[PDB]
Ligand binder design. Sequence first.
Ligand code: ZN
Ligand code: ZN
Ligand code: ZN
Ligand code: ZN
Ligand code: ZN
Ligand code: ZN
Lengths: 131, 131
Amino acid sequence: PPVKGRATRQRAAVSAALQEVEEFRSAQELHDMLKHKGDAVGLTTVYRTLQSLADAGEVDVLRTAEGESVYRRCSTGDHHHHLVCRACGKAVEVEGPAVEKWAEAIAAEHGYVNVAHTVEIFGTCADCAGA
Amino acid sequence: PPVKGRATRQRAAVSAALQEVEEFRSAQELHDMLKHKGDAVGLTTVYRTLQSLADAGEVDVLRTAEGESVYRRCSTGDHHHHLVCRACGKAVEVEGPAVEKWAEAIAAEHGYVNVAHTVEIFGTCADCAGA
Ligand SMILES: [Zn+2]
Ligand SMILES: [Zn+2]
Ligand SMILES: [Zn+2]
Ligand SMILES: [Zn+2]
Ligand SMILES: [Zn+2]
Ligand SMILES: [Zn+2]
């Protein structure tokens, strides 16, 4: 995950920590995990670098139900949607043409110039039922 | 939008305000319009009434880009989605069984028990582009 800014240990450390974790997590959780790992990196720095990465498109953003924001890194660069288990926090990426075709048809019917569709869905996975 | 508790002039006033308009708006925005027209109702009061209505489902909820939740008393009561223009605030009731079938199929394939899809499309009207 290259960063537009100059090469520094902060950007490399946060990028590596994000790569290690494969779960949607908030900025505070990321900062706490980085502190536990010994990075000793600032929360405000985490916020700025994370916003820069989100603007760069190398990372996947998501908004929590209560209002906070979680973020995750997905290997695929192509456009995709997310299934996120709130109980576990695990996220899996998928892609289905149906949403794209429906969005295009709706835009054509209503004459909208450009549209931006967000499809991030939630559901409990099997392990939650298991005890 | 009937309320579970005893009807009062404040609850009736906020209900009248909700049914008066059709665009999405937050508590502060609805409160501002009610204060201007001469209702003189409280902030936390309208917050509580809107939380109760959303619990009952009489109104429809939506988290904006910033995160704050805007609301709309929608005419149609069945399952539906909304196409929203941020520049205008108009909401168009659009429903498609294709997305529901896709969500059910992916949930079954992944073995997920329940699916709670969060789907929204943001766009701009043709008039918006024109000047
Ligand atoms: Zn992804
Ligand atoms: Zn899509
Ligand atoms: Zn789970
Ligand atoms: Zn509606
Ligand atoms: Zn639906
Ligand atoms: Zn518009």
